[PDB]
Amino acid sequence: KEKIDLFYGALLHDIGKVIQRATGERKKHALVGADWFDEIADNQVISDQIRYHMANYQSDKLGNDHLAYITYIADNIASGSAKIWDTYTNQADIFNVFGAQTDKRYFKPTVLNLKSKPNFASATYEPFSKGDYAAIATRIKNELAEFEFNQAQIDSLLNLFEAILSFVPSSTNSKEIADISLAEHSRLTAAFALAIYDYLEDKGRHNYKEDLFTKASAFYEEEAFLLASFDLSGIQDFIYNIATSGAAKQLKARSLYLDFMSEYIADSLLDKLGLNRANLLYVGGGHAYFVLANTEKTVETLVQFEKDFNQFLLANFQTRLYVAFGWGSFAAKDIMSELNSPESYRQIYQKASRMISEKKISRYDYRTLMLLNRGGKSSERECEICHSVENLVSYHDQKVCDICRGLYQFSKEIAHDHFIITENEGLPIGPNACLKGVAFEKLSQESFSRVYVKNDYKAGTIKATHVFVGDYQCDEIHKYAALSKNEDGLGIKRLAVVRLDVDDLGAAFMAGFSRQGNGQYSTLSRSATFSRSMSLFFKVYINQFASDKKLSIIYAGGDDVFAIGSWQDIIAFTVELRQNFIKWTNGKLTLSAGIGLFADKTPISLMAHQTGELEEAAKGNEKDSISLFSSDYTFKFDRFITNVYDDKLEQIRYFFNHQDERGKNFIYKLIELLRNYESEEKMNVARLAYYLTRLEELTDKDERDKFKQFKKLFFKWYTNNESDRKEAELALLLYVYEIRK
Amino acid sequence: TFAKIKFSAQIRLETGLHIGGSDAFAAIGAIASPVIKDPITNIPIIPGSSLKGKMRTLLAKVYNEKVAEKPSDDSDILSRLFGNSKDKRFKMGRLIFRDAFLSNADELDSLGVRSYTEVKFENTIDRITAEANPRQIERAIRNSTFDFELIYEITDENENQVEEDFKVIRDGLKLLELDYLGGSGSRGYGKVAFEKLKATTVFGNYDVKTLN
Amino acid sequence: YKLYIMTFQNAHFGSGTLDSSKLTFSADRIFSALVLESLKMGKLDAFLAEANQDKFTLTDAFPFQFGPFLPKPIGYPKHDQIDQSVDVKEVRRQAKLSKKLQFLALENVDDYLNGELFENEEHAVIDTVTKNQPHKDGNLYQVATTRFSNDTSLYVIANESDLLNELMSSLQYSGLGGKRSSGFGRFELDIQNIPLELSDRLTKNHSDKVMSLTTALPVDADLEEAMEDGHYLLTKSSGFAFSHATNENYRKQDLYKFASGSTFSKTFEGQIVDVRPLDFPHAVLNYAKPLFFKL
Ligand SMILES: Nc1ncnc2c1ncn2[C@@H]1O[C@H](COP(=O)(O)OP(=O)(O)OP(=O)(O)O)[C@@H](O)[C@H]1O
């Protein structure tokens, strides 16, 4: 009653700013959304919180303890007007105040849709922001009417509030406070509004300060907040592990087994304590942060939860799955008021990161460790899939155990858009909860529901919290090497494996906004929108750019991905995807990857393990490098497109193509001549001048401009620099694989 | 009772052969059949697995008592020299091979050579058209020695067929010289020759019986 | 007691799965080889009563390249021992290399605790090959090799007596891990005279901020006090047994022990655990005795 309506007050506290832009009303942002919400709905408790907030006082229609005073303290945490006349900017750039200062960028309040084109920030849009936009308030109309505000319908509002309002600014004031989006400002302040009410309730304190809390300086200095975070280990080892070649079909179903496990942590822990989805701050891949309160009852909740969450993960699994929590109390004065040094802002994360490295090397303890070293199994036939003997059953030809039993059925179930979380039917992901798909026919639904691609044209009676994960697939896994041939005959039965991993993310994340001594650049909302804007490109925008091409994304996230398929376009798509990230960040965050080619029908245990060593071996130079086949072609990543792919690849597709077939063997002597280079340097130059001049007279002499452009470029690209010879050697090798078989 | 019988010999290649490996590996281009070599130095080394599957195959057709349908099951008089997964009287065999390396580089560089391997051009006729699929392969050089190690040990308990096993190993190494070794040896690429076939005992428990 | 020096090249040392392989090897891999050759030679009733003599112990895999190498301490440095992270950009670029570190040099065992972060020397590159099986059509496996170069050796420290010198001398003509049927596991036994005068802090008595290695397993009795205020790292090692009477090849029970270089605070005991699935005429026993270092 008094708590359910409190969650809605922290979300629509600035809803009148959007209507003020369209409808010409000059009054106050806190009064437009108050009268507009009362026309559609019919509530009295929420009508008092939205009414007065700032520069209103209003000591009427209130007693002594009313839920309308804690909305001002939580609102100042996310931050750092009356009549409107002009607009300074329209959604300031987040990457602009990160790192150096380059060209100005301006976003555009469009519609977040998978089929719609992304709105890149540039100087083309009008920075004045004319007060109009007849499409920003047209969608929000029929979806708001007829909606019961209770406990069962409290999480469905967050799935729509960030569906089109993700490109809407919040409180445009100068430059320091302008890049904070409205979808992230109202979402982050919802967690602080509940922590204040829970802090005074557990300690036995009421709202005695009537009309504006006069003790604002003393409340910010007292530590009344808790920062919790987990670190799920066992992702790149349990998924990338197999012993048979015929088990390549369940590769996609195996990667999705741990994807929904991290989403379940942000559901059972937030509901058992007594909160909602306001603590969701980038959940996915075993890396998420949760803000709470420095009380006494909420501390015992995470201690008991971690002791039972790892209990059922011991009999079915072994020891590769473990979740290590990490709490860290802090104060509200570290992100506002004084303390301009970056040490005050980084101290919050250091209090919850030192124990993570200690708890992972101290998992099990007494008695619990004796469960694995018991000794009672007398089996002799293993599964040869996950190296575990538990509930053996014959389905294909070997003996399928219990862990990999549901992976074969779930492989043909990912195509279902809607999912149903059961109890004892499906893949076990929690204590007493499972997960399975459905063909749009809810016949049970006991717990919750998690779907995907739920943004536009999907807001009926679904009731499901959508996540961020890929779904675009092709057909099987062990068949991309055969479908990599057109009609004339090119390419062979090979494939490439690339692991894109963006850099400059783990470092310079908390103190990367410092550029001026005036602003503190330590607002929590500034870092929330920084990781959320990049999380949209490495997951949602990947499926949009996957059109007109056969691929299959595996493990989607904002850190490291996994792509596989025909190598006829992955090489060209890997460098093309990086070009879209540089323009999005205005050339401030680098990117790295690792294209690796292997054979056909190879075990994933070693195929996906050898392709990851190329990224570690490329770190010898600095931070921007990539390797191709072996560990010798370690360039500068970006140099591959500015030299090799620039003129060494475009100006060769139609020069030597006319000399193919009848003269295809003439290129084999060129890639082999550059092999013996460490022997003699004087002999390697004189020998090259003999086999190159023979390709001018033997060919057709009718066209003078056929070999003249190729002879001049081949001589300069080889005799100019020692490190430059590797560019011409790799360019000539990629052309041989282009036309083959 | 227990000793290690080492048959130190020198494998002299009288004819250049070819051994296939992984596609687009130990080289730079996936063409002309890349020959497997050494990951450290550019020395065309021969793996020890090629001598295990070839010597046992040619042995199961001159001294056998059962139709060889699958390995580790063909007869039993010769399965004790390599291994057997079905029989429980013995786990593995009594012969251990080793990846022989090219030790002829001490005098090959004095002659002045370019590379250790060459590219050979071959083709075929479809019996209805002219040249069909002008392919190409990669062969090695001849007159090259290799350090082959043949370790033999007895299990003490079954010390009664020692003289019977000596005539089998000597016949297996001599029969290999009259047949191709490696791959694609039907046209005349294999045919090795175990030069300087001598035996020695590096332990001190079993005296030397024979030499050749 | 002395020590043995041996090197490996073009060998194979798997870990967890047959197709996968690593660089070093566990401590129980050496002990399982001397017992197999004891029954074949003719002294099975003499080697079993020698390993359980307390003073007789073995070590794990330690690289040897112009000097002995020692693993890095797990947990060091702590939050107060390490320097204050003033600039997060210059700390995260060097702190990740210490986590992926393999082994430390013999001259850096005293300066690493005061502040030293560098990249470990590359031992060897991981090389793999491929094979098949004709006259079957339906078999394609992948194996890897451990071709060491740049003078890479793996020494071992044991108790030299008048019987151990005749047992491990014949092991160089056999195999140790990996594809033993092909010839992966041969080494070269090299003996010297006076051992190293620096790595002589091995004892089993006091416990003053020591560190146990060899991936040993604590005793089932004392464990509440030894594990308290300590660190460890669970691994994975299993596989079938070695027998000649059973025709089923039963799977042995897993023994998730610790890792090398784990710091503790109490002297362990080191017992012998019995692992028997169903029934076997022999006896499968585990060794791995802990060895403390004064640091
Ligand atoms: N969006 C995000 N929000 C919060 N934390 C994140 C986010 N993305 C990544 N991280 C954190 O970053 C860590 C991974 O760091 P990473 O390995 O990318 O560093 P790195 O780029 O290798 O560093 P360097 O470039 O110095 O080598 C994870 O532990 C995760 O907790």
JSON list of N, CA and C in Angstrom, two decimals, chain B residues 1 9 18 29 31-33 37 43 46 51 53 56 69 76 79 94 118 122 125 139 141 157 167 169-170 186 195:
[
{"chain": "B", "resi": 1, "resn": "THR", "atom": "N", "xyz": [66.13, -60.17, -16.51]},
{"chain": "B", "resi": 1, "resn": "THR", "atom": "CA", "xyz": [64.89, -59.95, -15.77]},
{"chain": "B", "resi": 1, "resn": "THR", "atom": "C", "xyz": [64.15, -58.72, -16.30]},
{"chain": "B", "resi": 9, "resn": "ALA", "atom": "N", "xyz": [69.47, -47.16, -35.14]},
{"chain": "B", "resi": 9, "resn": "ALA", "atom": "CA", "xyz": [69.66, -47.29, -36.58]},
{"chain": "B", "resi": 9, "resn": "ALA", "atom": "C", "xyz": [69.52, -45.92, -37.23]},
{"chain": "B", "resi": 18, "resn": "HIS", "atom": "N", "xyz": [56.13, -38.47, -49.18]},
{"chain": "B", "resi": 18, "resn": "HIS", "atom": "CA", "xyz": [55.25, -37.39, -48.79]},
{"chain": "B", "resi": 18, "resn": "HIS", "atom": "C", "xyz": [54.38, -37.84, -47.63]},
{"chain": "B", "resi": 29, "resn": "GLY", "atom": "N", "xyz": [50.47, -21.20, -46.95]},
{"chain": "B", "resi": 29, "resn": "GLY", "atom": "CA", "xyz": [49.34, -21.31, -47.85]},
{"chain": "B", "resi": 29, "resn": "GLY", "atom": "C", "xyz": [48.81, -22.73, -47.89]},
{"chain": "B", "resi": 31, "resn": "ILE", "atom": "N", "xyz": [47.86, -24.95, -49.99]},
{"chain": "B", "resi": 31, "resn": "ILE", "atom": "CA", "xyz": [47.95, -25.39, -51.37]},
{"chain": "B", "resi": 31, "resn": "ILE", "atom": "C", "xyz": [49.23, -26.20, -51.52]},
{"chain": "B", "resi": 32, "resn": "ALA", "atom": "N", "xyz": [49.28, -27.03, -52.57]},
{"chain": "B", "resi": 32, "resn": "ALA", "atom": "CA", "xyz": [50.44, -27.86, -52.89]},
{"chain": "B", "resi": 32, "resn": "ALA", "atom": "C", "xyz": [50.76, -28.85, -51.78]},
{"chain": "B", "resi": 33, "resn": "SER", "atom": "N", "xyz": [49.75, -29.20, -50.97]},
{"chain": "B", "resi": 33, "resn": "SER", "atom": "CA", "xyz": [49.85, -30.16, -49.88]},
{"chain": "B", "resi": 33, "resn": "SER", "atom": "C", "xyz": [50.95, -29.75, -48.90]},
{"chain": "B", "resi": 37, "resn": "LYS", "atom": "N", "xyz": [55.98, -30.18, -40.38]},
{"chain": "B", "resi": 37, "resn": "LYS", "atom": "CA", "xyz": [57.38, -30.03, -40.00]},
{"chain": "B", "resi": 37, "resn": "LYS", "atom": "C", "xyz": [57.52, -29.80, -38.50]},
{"chain": "B", "resi": 43, "resn": "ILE", "atom": "N", "xyz": [62.81, -27.62, -39.91]},
{"chain": "B", "resi": 43, "resn": "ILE", "atom": "CA", "xyz": [63.40, -28.94, -40.16]},
{"chain": "B", "resi": 43, "resn": "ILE", "atom": "C", "xyz": [62.26, -29.92, -40.42]},
{"chain": "B", "resi": 46, "resn": "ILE", "atom": "N", "xyz": [59.68, -36.10, -39.06]},
{"chain": "B", "resi": 46, "resn": "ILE", "atom": "CA", "xyz": [58.68, -37.13, -39.31]},
{"chain": "B", "resi": 46, "resn": "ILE", "atom": "C", "xyz": [58.05, -37.52, -37.97]},
{"chain": "B", "resi": 51, "resn": "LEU", "atom": "N", "xyz": [54.90, -44.47, -38.16]},
{"chain": "B", "resi": 51, "resn": "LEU", "atom": "CA", "xyz": [55.58, -45.76, -38.11]},
{"chain": "B", "resi": 51, "resn": "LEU", "atom": "C", "xyz": [54.82, -46.79, -37.28]},
{"chain": "B", "resi": 53, "resn": "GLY", "atom": "N", "xyz": [51.25, -47.12, -37.20]},
{"chain": "B", "resi": 53, "resn": "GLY", "atom": "CA", "xyz": [50.13, -47.63, -37.97]},
{"chain": "B", "resi": 53, "resn": "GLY", "atom": "C", "xyz": [50.51, -48.34, -39.24]},
{"chain": "B", "resi": 56, "resn": "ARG", "atom": "N", "xyz": [52.48, -52.08, -38.05]},
{"chain": "B", "resi": 56, "resn": "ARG", "atom": "CA", "xyz": [51.52, -53.05, -37.54]},
{"chain": "B", "resi": 56, "resn": "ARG", "atom": "C", "xyz": [50.59, -53.56, -38.64]},
{"chain": "B", "resi": 69, "resn": "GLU", "atom": "N", "xyz": [40.01, -57.36, -39.03]},
{"chain": "B", "resi": 69, "resn": "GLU", "atom": "CA", "xyz": [38.87, -56.49, -39.30]},
{"chain": "B", "resi": 69, "resn": "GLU", "atom": "C", "xyz": [38.97, -55.14, -38.61]},
{"chain": "B", "resi": 76, "resn": "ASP", "atom": "N", "xyz": [46.65, -62.41, -31.91]},
{"chain": "B", "resi": 76, "resn": "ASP", "atom": "CA", "xyz": [47.12, -62.13, -30.56]},
{"chain": "B", "resi": 76, "resn": "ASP", "atom": "C", "xyz": [48.63, -62.30, -30.47]},
{"chain": "B", "resi": 79, "resn": "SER", "atom": "N", "xyz": [49.77, -58.68, -31.23]},
{"chain": "B", "resi": 79, "resn": "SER", "atom": "CA", "xyz": [49.16, -57.56, -30.54]},
{"chain": "B", "resi": 79, "resn": "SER", "atom": "C", "xyz": [49.95, -57.13, -29.31]},
{"chain": "B", "resi": 94, "resn": "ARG", "atom": "N", "xyz": [55.38, -53.62, -26.16]},
{"chain": "B", "resi": 94, "resn": "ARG", "atom": "CA", "xyz": [56.77, -53.61, -25.71]},
{"chain": "B", "resi": 94, "resn": "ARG", "atom": "C", "xyz": [57.67, -52.82, -26.66]},
{"chain": "B", "resi": 118, "resn": "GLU", "atom": "N", "xyz": [60.62, -29.48, -51.99]},
{"chain": "B", "resi": 118, "resn": "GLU", "atom": "CA", "xyz": [60.34, -28.98, -53.33]},
{"chain": "B", "resi": 118, "resn": "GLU", "atom": "C", "xyz": [58.90, -29.28, -53.69]},
{"chain": "B", "resi": 122, "resn": "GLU", "atom": "N", "xyz": [51.86, -32.65, -60.79]},
{"chain": "B", "resi": 122, "resn": "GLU", "atom": "CA", "xyz": [51.23, -33.86, -61.27]},
{"chain": "B", "resi": 122, "resn": "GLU", "atom": "C", "xyz": [49.82, -33.53, -61.75]},
{"chain": "B", "resi": 125, "resn": "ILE", "atom": "N", "xyz": [44.23, -37.87, -66.12]},
{"chain": "B", "resi": 125, "resn": "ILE", "atom": "CA", "xyz": [43.42, -37.88, -67.33]},
{"chain": "B", "resi": 125, "resn": "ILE", "atom": "C", "xyz": [42.08, -38.51, -67.01]},
{"chain": "B", "resi": 139, "resn": "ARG", "atom": "N", "xyz": [57.18, -32.69, -52.00]},
{"chain": "B", "resi": 139, "resn": "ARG", "atom": "CA", "xyz": [57.99, -33.82, -51.58]},
{"chain": "B", "resi": 139, "resn": "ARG", "atom": "C", "xyz": [59.22, -33.33, -50.82]},
{"chain": "B", "resi": 141, "resn": "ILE", "atom": "N", "xyz": [63.56, -34.44, -49.72]},
{"chain": "B", "resi": 141, "resn": "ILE", "atom": "CA", "xyz": [64.79, -34.81, -50.40]},
{"chain": "B", "resi": 141, "resn": "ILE", "atom": "C", "xyz": [65.18, -36.22, -49.98]},
{"chain": "B", "resi": 157, "resn": "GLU", "atom": "N", "xyz": [57.82, -61.54, -16.07]},
{"chain": "B", "resi": 157, "resn": "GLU", "atom": "CA", "xyz": [56.92, -62.68, -15.86]},
{"chain": "B", "resi": 157, "resn": "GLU", "atom": "C", "xyz": [56.80, -63.53, -17.12]},
{"chain": "B", "resi": 167, "resn": "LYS", "atom": "N", "xyz": [62.89, -62.64, -33.97]},
{"chain": "B", "resi": 167, "resn": "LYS", "atom": "CA", "xyz": [62.69, -62.90, -35.39]},
{"chain": "B", "resi": 167, "resn": "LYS", "atom": "C", "xyz": [61.51, -62.14, -35.97]},
{"chain": "B", "resi": 169, "resn": "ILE", "atom": "N", "xyz": [60.64, -58.78, -34.92]},
{"chain": "B", "resi": 169, "resn": "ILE", "atom": "CA", "xyz": [61.05, -57.38, -35.07]},
{"chain": "B", "resi": 169, "resn": "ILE", "atom": "C", "xyz": [62.01, -57.24, -36.24]},
{"chain": "B", "resi": 170, "resn": "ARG", "atom": "N", "xyz": [62.94, -58.19, -36.39]},
{"chain": "B", "resi": 170, "resn": "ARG", "atom": "CA", "xyz": [63.88, -58.13, -37.51]},
{"chain": "B", "resi": 170, "resn": "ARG", "atom": "C", "xyz": [63.16, -58.31, -38.84]},
{"chain": "B", "resi": 186, "resn": "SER", "atom": "N", "xyz": [52.21, -45.29, -53.55]},
{"chain": "B", "resi": 186, "resn": "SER", "atom": "CA", "xyz": [51.89, -46.32, -54.53]},
{"chain": "B", "resi": 186, "resn": "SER", "atom": "C", "xyz": [52.62, -46.10, -55.85]},
{"chain": "B", "resi": 195, "resn": "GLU", "atom": "N", "xyz": [69.75, -48.13, -42.44]},
{"chain": "B", "resi": 195, "resn": "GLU", "atom": "CA", "xyz": [71.20, -48.23, -42.53]},
{"chain": "B", "resi": 195, "resn": "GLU", "atom": "C", "xyz": [71.81, -48.32, -41.14]}
]
